[PDB]
């Protein structure tokens, strides 16, 4: 059934599973036409497919050419997501195929179930968790490869950098969800917190800065403060 606060540890067991987030697949800017009507212009998007145990991220870049001459694009975006996730599963060796796919949005269930009919033993699950994976495009290196793409492309990352050398996958996921929740709530403030000390850099092969264990505690505290402030503002509480 649904993945929730109750069954959260299941994310870090030894059963291969992927989160799929389709938020950033179909992206547009809304603008005025010469005649004063409104139109959209698509920009490149991405499917965010993440192994929460290992940090392996399958970033399938969705090039605007996909949408050319298609109707009902927000509907099509879900089916295109399910087509590409199905294609990714088929591309993996059997021993690397997921046992479960957790979709962040309930509207992905039917599209993914129908594309995965050939895999009756892979469970397609919704979640009650309100995960901040929409903010993936606030990670500068992910945003940069998506915008630069001139054709459909799959790019592989580890979203945890080298963190699993020092921390468990539970702690790594918690740090990732905190960073993304801060980036989602106040991007400018979160990015200021992450880059404020010029001496801490991002390795060429990494997404996030090279914080010591003590610096990560300071950073995580700054992200928590950012999130609660913004919350008091949002709700006047």
């Amino acid at each position: 059934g649904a993945m929730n606060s109750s069954n959260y540890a299941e994310l870090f067991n030894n059963d291969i599973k992927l989160f799929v987030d389709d938020t950033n697949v179909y992206r547009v800017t809304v603008h005025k036409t010469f005649e004063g009507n409104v139109a959209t212009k698509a920009i490149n998007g991405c499917i965010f497919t993440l192994n929460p145990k290992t940090g392996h991220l399958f970033l399938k870049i969705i090039h605007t050419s996909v949408w050319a001459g298609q109707k009902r694009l927000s509907q099509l975006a879900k089916w295109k997501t399910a087509e590409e996730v199905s294609a990714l599963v088929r591309s993996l060796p059997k021993e690397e195929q997921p046992k479960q796919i957790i979709v962040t949005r309930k509207a992905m269930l039917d599209p993914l179930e129908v594309h995965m009919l050939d895999f009756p033993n892979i469970a397609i699950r919704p979640t009650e968790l309100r995960l901040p994976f929409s903010a993936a495009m606030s990670i500068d290196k992910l945003s940069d490869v998506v915008m630069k793409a001139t054709e459909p492309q799959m790019v592989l990352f580890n979203i945890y950098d080298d963190w699993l050398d020092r921390i468990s996958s539970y702690t790594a996921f918690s740090r990732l969800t905190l960073l993304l929740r801060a980036l989602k709530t106040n991007e400018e403030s979160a990015k200021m917190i992450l880059l404020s000390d010029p001496t801490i850099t991002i390795k060429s092969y990494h997404l996030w800065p090279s914080f010591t264990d003590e610096q990560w505690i300071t950073i995580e505290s700054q992200m928590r403060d950012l999130i609660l402030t913004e919350y008091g503002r949002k709700y006047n509480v």
Binding site: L76, W79, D110, P111, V114, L117, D118
Partner: protein, 300 residues
């Protein structure tokens, strides 16, 4: 005009014949039903006064043999049987008729209700859904599960309705996932009509039989099948015009006949709202939409 004689009525029972019903008292001198119209299937159905659980009954066609009802005190039900001796049977019926111990099938001349509910229903198709090849008539009851319900446990007592599943490889061509899921025309027209049913008449016959089992026995699996066969047509963008016109007539008479008090359990809100207001065929079922809006506006 054919007759189904009864040996006796030893237990108090409500007896149904098609859309009609009669209360019979324990040991009331009741000996059957005469003047049954030839040319249609019929159903004779029972609900005991002491156990209003298990409605049960028999589908039959008097053209196929001489049938009678006899109570079995061991199995505790009214059973249909075939009399193979024509002269014994004619003599039984003639005697009971002379003593006027038979009710008359109470058909109004103007009234095409039964024809309209059974237009495509054939005994030979019923006998493939309800498998008991040694009898020419078919037993159905409230509790019998469908092959589809069983997949998801006694195979010999199942309703072998055609399995319809919108999220199945049968329903979805590899490479046409979105197209086939959002527009079920290939599943309706190639897989079901051309492939399995062979023609719209056999499809409608099964749809009408499922409805009648839902209505007369409260058979839940039958109600599921009736709605699935409606949804498969309404969810297809491409349906022959004769089929849509015929479906509107079929459903109109089904909704007209349904007891007003059973709309809550026998009608699926999602399917009817989707079929009448959202589907490709939202504007193709004028008669059905008008009777549903006047008879069951709460459901909608």
């Amino acid at each position: 005009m054919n007759t189904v004689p009864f040996t006796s009525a030893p237990i108090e029972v409500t007896i149904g014949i098609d859309q009609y019903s009669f209360n019979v008292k324990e040991n009331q001198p009741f000996h059957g039903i005469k003047d049954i119209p030839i040319g249609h299937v019929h159903v004779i159905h029972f609900q005991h006064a002491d156990n209003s659980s298990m409605r049960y009954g028999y589908w039959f066609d008097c053209r196929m043999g001489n049938f009678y009802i006899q109570y079995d005190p061991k199995d505790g039900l009214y059973k249909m049987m075939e009399e193979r001796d024509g002269a014994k049977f004619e003599n039984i019926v003639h005697n009971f008729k002379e003593r006027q111990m038979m009710v008359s099938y109470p058909k109004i001349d103007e009234d095409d209700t039964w024809y309209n509910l059974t237009e495509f229903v054939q005994m030979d198709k019923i006998r493939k859904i309800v498998r008991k090849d040694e009898n020419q008539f078919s037993y159905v009851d409230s509790s019998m599960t469908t092959v589809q319900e069983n997949e998801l446990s006694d195979p010999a007592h199942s309703l072998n309705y055609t399995v319809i599943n919108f999220k199945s490889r049968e329903a979805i061509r590899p490479g046409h996932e979105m197209e086939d899921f959002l527009d079920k025309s290939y599943y309706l027209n190639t897989v079901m009509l051309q492939g399995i049913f062979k023609n719209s008449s056999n499809y409608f016959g099964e749809l009408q039989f499922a409805f009648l089992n839902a209505m007369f026995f409260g058979n839940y699996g039958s109600s599921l099948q009736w709605h699935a066969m409606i949804e498969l047509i309404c969810s297809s963008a491409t349906v022959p015009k004769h089929m849509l016109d015929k479906l509107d007539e079929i459903l109109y008479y089904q909704i007209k006949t349904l007891p007003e008090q059973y709309s809550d359990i026998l009608l699926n809100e999602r399917v009817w709202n989707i079929c009448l207001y959202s589907s490709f065929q939202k504007n193709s079922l004028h008669n059905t939409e008008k009777i549903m809006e006047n008879k069951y506006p709460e459901l909608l």
